[PDB]
Symmetry: C2
Subunit: 597 residues, 2 copies
Amino acid sequence: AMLYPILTQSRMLIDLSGTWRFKLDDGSGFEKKWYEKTLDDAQLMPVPSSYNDIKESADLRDHYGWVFYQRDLNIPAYLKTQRIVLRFAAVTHSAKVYVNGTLLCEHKGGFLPFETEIPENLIRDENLLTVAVDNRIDHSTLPVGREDESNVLGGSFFPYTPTKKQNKPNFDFFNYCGITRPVKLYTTPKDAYISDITLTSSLENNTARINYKIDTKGSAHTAIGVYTKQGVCVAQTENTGTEGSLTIENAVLWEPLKPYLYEVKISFGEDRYTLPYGIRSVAVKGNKFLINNKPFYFKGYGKHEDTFPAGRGLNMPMNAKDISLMKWQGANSFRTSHYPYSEEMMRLCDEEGIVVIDETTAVGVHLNFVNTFDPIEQGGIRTQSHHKEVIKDLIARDKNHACVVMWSIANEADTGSKGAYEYFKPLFDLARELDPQKRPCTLVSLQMVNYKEDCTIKLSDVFCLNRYYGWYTCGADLQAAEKMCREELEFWNSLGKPFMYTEYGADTVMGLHDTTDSMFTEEYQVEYYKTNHKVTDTLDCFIGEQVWNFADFATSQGLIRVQGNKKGLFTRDRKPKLAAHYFKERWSKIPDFGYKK
Amino acid sequence: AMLYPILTQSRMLIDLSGTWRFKLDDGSGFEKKWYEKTLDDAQLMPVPSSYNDIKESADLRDHYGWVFYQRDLNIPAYLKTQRIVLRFAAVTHSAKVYVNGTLLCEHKGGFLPFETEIPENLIRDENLLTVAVDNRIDHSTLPVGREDESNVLGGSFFPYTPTKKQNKPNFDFFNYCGITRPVKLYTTPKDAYISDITLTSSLENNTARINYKIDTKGSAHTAIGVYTKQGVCVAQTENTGTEGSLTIENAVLWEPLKPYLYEVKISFGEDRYTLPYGIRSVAVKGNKFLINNKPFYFKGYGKHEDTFPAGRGLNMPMNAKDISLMKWQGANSFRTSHYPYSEEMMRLCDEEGIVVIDETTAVGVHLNFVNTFDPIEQGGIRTQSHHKEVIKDLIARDKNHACVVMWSIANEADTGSKGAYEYFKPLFDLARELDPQKRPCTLVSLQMVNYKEDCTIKLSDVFCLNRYYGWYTCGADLQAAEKMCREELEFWNSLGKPFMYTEYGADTVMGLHDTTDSMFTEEYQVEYYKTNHKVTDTLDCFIGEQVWNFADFATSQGLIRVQGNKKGLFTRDRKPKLAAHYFKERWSKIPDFGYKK
Ligand SMILES: [Cl-]
Ligand SMILES: [Cl-]
Ligand SMILES: [Cl-]
Ligand SMILES: [Cl-]
């Protein structure tokens, strides 16, 4: 259970972000127990931020292993009358958290929150908070790191021996690590408090019924009230226990680009918590993706959390800039490729009416780009257990978001190979079991020669395809790209279920131009997209287009990465390429609902 | 025999360059004998120029097969008292030349001149000159085109069927074709004229002895005179026949960056011809490359003939700009990668004191990047016969240039495989036989794991290496690049013979930057070069550094070509990247002679 920490009449909220001490592990930090004392001979690092790009050091950017963050934590003893909690919104990839040299918690998974109470007895007059952060990835982590597998995107013409041991990402984006999202101290009443809130809605005529389950610790009485934005109470139930329901007459529905959030206020004993909440329905019916019973057409992007110089770190001005650009362009949606995004972004999307495909950290689950899904004993991928935990934690965090309409279980896994169905079926079953709203589930399909053998066909409610007709195949032959595109997409269209692009694009360096089709130029990016839409616009089961990518982003180094991935419609500093203007024109003429009715 | 056409007291020179008619072959141009009539429904094309980039049409740029050029040729009948010659400086790749629907000549080889007399009887009051130009390349052409071999640099992740049949270059640079260099009509006396001039020099104390052989047609008397730039006669011999010698007291030697050209004036009957000529010696001795008996250090580049929009076409303002930039940067030399350059450039290098490594068209002689040098019956490369002709014609054209100090027999052939020595030994023997000055010969060595098996070791006077330590291997690991560089180059240094870099570089997009080593940025280009020089500056047999490339240039399309090849020190419009300033500083501090003495 991970409610977003907020300031309330029963809950303090103390941000610990700022300038922290920082030290690379030299192989002796745990042996010499650096967490027991002030870090010596240390640097300074902003928190929240990825650490890789803050300095000018390749040894720091390309570090392998642990680093140690630390700050002083001097708090009033009178907080000891309350329950005291340290919340880590995200520490990438793995964390060990120490207060005064006592290990308080550990966490695996770099993109979801975790928390620990501080035992009263540990809090001295002066305290040290130390966070050790591990950046290493392998066959057991999500995202996956290679072990003996070859570098496909960053391969040399002639092999060489690396100077130092390094991570081997099985994914494109740069392995930004550190204290990615805010660290905060918060409090709740000690004896009785709210641990979780679950809300589902049903629309009977113009009356919404909101079913609630309020999970609590301790013995007290539970109450719930639903308020309009302007502050009018529209439903209230007292002494309701855990489960109940209530109704809102003439409810205002949350719609894409037309958001409406009620405020759901909960009391339990002395505890107070307010959750914003939008009322909307999601259903797949035939080849339609229905939001509030209307056939939606996705217009948008796969994104990354990527800005300079914080890397993956929470950047709230850029989040607001990015949503503004989305509305400027006529987009209505994006996918959280390839990890859960910050709660601050997710809550902002609820407020702004941006639809979200919420995706796990499960990218790189692919050992043949020994079978990927062989038994662990025979060398198969070792991620399924953690994959289950990620699904649990992602849905627990994001279940109440109106903006989340579909779960993406994995990106570009080896879904055309033997054992893939056996790996994924329990994960799809888990997502359907745990999501109270029973939203659609998908996996994001890698381009593959044997596409009819993609186990997505047996599992997903929507088929989500990553396809690069005119880039990774048919480059500079867009007539051949159109023919190859049509041949495959007519197969998917024949299945009668909704399908969409979750990735399609062409690397494009701003400022490169040619009137005559030429890879990496701004004009070719436009022609690539025109060619694909010639096909997709004729297919009635094709219900959405999300480009790769919203913006240029950092990646590992190699011969096909021109200082990162250049498939953005915008540059890394959010400037529009020619194709950004193309999509503004195109999306201006396509309705959010009823394009393919 | 191909003397450069000049205006003299016995020789008219009439340039036919300008706007010509132009038509793509549609498969019927020879059947319908388009050369017999004015081209119908034709476009217009500048001559000289490559045709590929003049318009905005991909079908034109990527044309496969023949095109037809044509112009009117209305000349005075009184020229019929003279011998009338049509000179094609270069037609890329193969040509058929028609006057009034009579086929006058055909030529194979896109980068060397050819000529034909016009029979008096064919010249009507009004005439048509038609040039059919073939762009097709295969296992029998230089440069080599692939037939069934795979595309290594421009390969897709997923195979596709091309829309139309296209050339398959076995080389990086774009396959620019057309009437690349000027077409001119010239005249000589009919009955007796000079066909060729051969000069060699010997330095006895401060006296130069110039040995001459004047090849003529007809019966007349031969005379030769050598004049200073200011016009003083310094040697003269009359009625000398074909072979002879003469001496120049206190001769001014041609030196790199300090050129001096005498004027050698020849008369034969009524014919007059003037050849510029620099006096200098070239010899390899031990690990030294001696120009005028002093140990030279090459500083410069592999170039291309490449500008926008003419492609490969002769661009005389840019030739002068390029030499000016070379002198600005402190360079002393370049290689004509990967084909003979225009006579206008070669004569300008003589005038300006730029040293030249003169290279054949033999790039792509490599079928395993069936053995490359298997017998033709078993599928081996079919180029050796034409390769011999190219060597003959290149040396015949350029033998008298002081600026030419070494012949490059081939670039990046399969010289580490069986049969390579057997293929190349006759070609090296031919070059040594035909060059009157017996200049050094080399081949330019591809980077290869089995470098000790490179047959260059058995054939070349100088070992010329193309090496990409820190780009195609060890990318973004320059410490590993330095170690791998040193390990291999210490082998070459142990052989005791002169060796050099003819290629080394890193793709660099102007305007991309990072303080921290990152491929494709301007800073990484500098660090790449610093790392390599750390090694080469410590090796006493390493006698020269020529970067890849002088300037960004156009290539085929593919995932590793960011709108062409970006390894230029300068952009395509000749603007300096950071590394251009690095080399200006570095070469400013390295003498042309006696750096490694
Ligand atoms: Cl990615
Ligand atoms: Cl991509
Ligand atoms: Cl090239
Ligand atoms: Cl290259």
